[PDB]
Design a protein around this nucleic acid. Structure first.
Ligand SMILES: Nc1ccn([C@H]2C[C@H](O)[C@@H](COP(=O)(O)NP(=O)(O)OP(=O)(O)O)O2)c(=O)n1
Ligand SMILES: [Mg+2]
Ligand SMILES: [Mg+2]
Ligand code: NA
Ligand code: NA
Length: 325
DNA sequence: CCGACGTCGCATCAGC
DNA sequence: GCTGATGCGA
DNA sequence: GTCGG
């Protein structure tokens, strides 16, 4: 709320660069700037004040001035009144449609929800689903419902094998009063970095959730990542809207790196990996490795908590609550 | 003043 | 049926 | 767009 206008502005500008100009690094610059300002504990009162923050340069400082002085930004107005930019901006909000495809549709005269629906023959499976539940995916999820979903997921997982461990990551583990979707970290002793002894570990769980009709649709699926759709049973009351669900099977010994990645926030993670690079380290959802002078990563260093990974790169441990950067 | 910018999974594609 | 990338997403 | 460095 504090510098809400500025952050909203930069976020809107960011989406425009990602979705329309297809400049993902401008999009990341703008989102990093908004982040740096979101943590800035003062009401920013000039572009000069903002420029001193890392990630804010001249161009954003000038825009911050125009906004503080006028309450708007002409660039945003020009963008908002462009059909092309707006149609493109909008189509990207459908799951499966990004900058490239959204433009392909607009080039083809396809720009409305209605336009998409009479041209379903042009949508792959993913895009088809994201369109079917576009209205449902636009709603956020009460934590009260997340808990309901958590009991269901954790329980079905138990039934397949009692040695499975399921953990609801994402914004939920960050204690958010509501969430965009459900992210589940999953482990099993059979699957480590040192071997895969059992086949179809993710698959079994997906089928179990499907056979009991928790999971309804499937965007994409692999041996370690499931991306789909699920729904709380309503009693018949109105139907709960469908929700996105991601499941990520991480090798059990690499759990702490996995839960670190999967908990977020996204721009927390980016800045953290950016920092690790400033220390001769590199991090993914699996490991933390020391960068060789040659660029090539050395062996995975031992890790036994999210904190361990913080220590390696000299950073104060921060509970999930404070990672929503 | 240029170049790099987190790091990966899944579906697919241009070259072999 | 691989590598290396695009595209989209986490 | 920013900063590295
Ligand atoms: N670009 C990205 C996107 C997601 N992620 C990681 C951190 C995210 O918290 C985690 C799950 O992504 P997510 O479900 O899209 N967003 P998240 O759970 O943080 O908040 P919601 O908007 O879903 O409530 O994936 C990332 O590391 N880099
Ligand atoms: Mg989430
Ligand atoms: Mg998710
Ligand atoms: Na700066
Ligand atoms: Na999209």
């Amino acid at each position: 709320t504090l510098n809400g206008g500025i952050t909203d502005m930069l976020t809107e500008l960011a989406n425009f660069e990602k979705n329309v100009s297809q400049a993902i690094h401008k999009y990341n610059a703008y989102r990093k700037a908004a982040s740096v300002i979101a943590k800035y504990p003062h009401k920013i009162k000039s572009g000069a004040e903002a420029k001193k923050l890392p990630g804010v340069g001249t161009k954003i400082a000038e825009k911050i001035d125009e906004f503080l002085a006028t309450g708007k930004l002409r660039k945003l107005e020009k963008i908002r009144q462009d059909d092309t930019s707006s149609s493109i901006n909008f189509l990207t909000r459908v799951s499966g449609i990004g900058p490239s495809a959204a433009r392909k549709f607009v080039d083809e005269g396809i720009k409305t929800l209605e336009d998409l629906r009479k041209n379903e023959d042009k949508l792959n499976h993913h895009q088809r689903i994201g369109l079917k539940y576009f209205g449902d995916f636009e709603k956020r999820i009460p934590r009260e419902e997340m808990l309901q979903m958590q009991d269901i997921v954790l329980n079905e997982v138990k039934k397949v094998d009692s040695e499975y461990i399921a953990t609801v990551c994402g914004s939920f583990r960050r204690g958010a009063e509501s969430s965009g979707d459900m992210d589940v970290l999953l482990t099993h002793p059979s699957f480590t970095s040192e071997s895969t002894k059992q086949p179809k570990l993710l698959h079994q769980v997906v089928e179990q959730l499907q056979k009991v009709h928790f999971i309804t649709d499937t965007l994409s699926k692999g041996e370690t990542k499931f991306m789909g759709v699920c729904q709380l049973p309503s009693k018949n009351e109105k139907e709960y809207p469908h929700r996105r669900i991601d499941i990520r099977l991480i090798p059990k010994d690499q759990y702490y790196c996995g839960v670190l990645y999967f908990t977020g926030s996204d721009i927390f993670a980016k800045n953290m990996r950016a920092h690790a690079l400033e220390k001769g380290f590199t991090i993914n959802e699996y490991t933390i490795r020391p960068l060789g002078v040659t660029g090539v990563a050395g062996e995975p260093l031992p890790v036994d908590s999210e904190k361990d990974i913080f220590d390696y790169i000299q950073w104060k441990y921060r509970e999930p609550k404070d990672r929503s950067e």
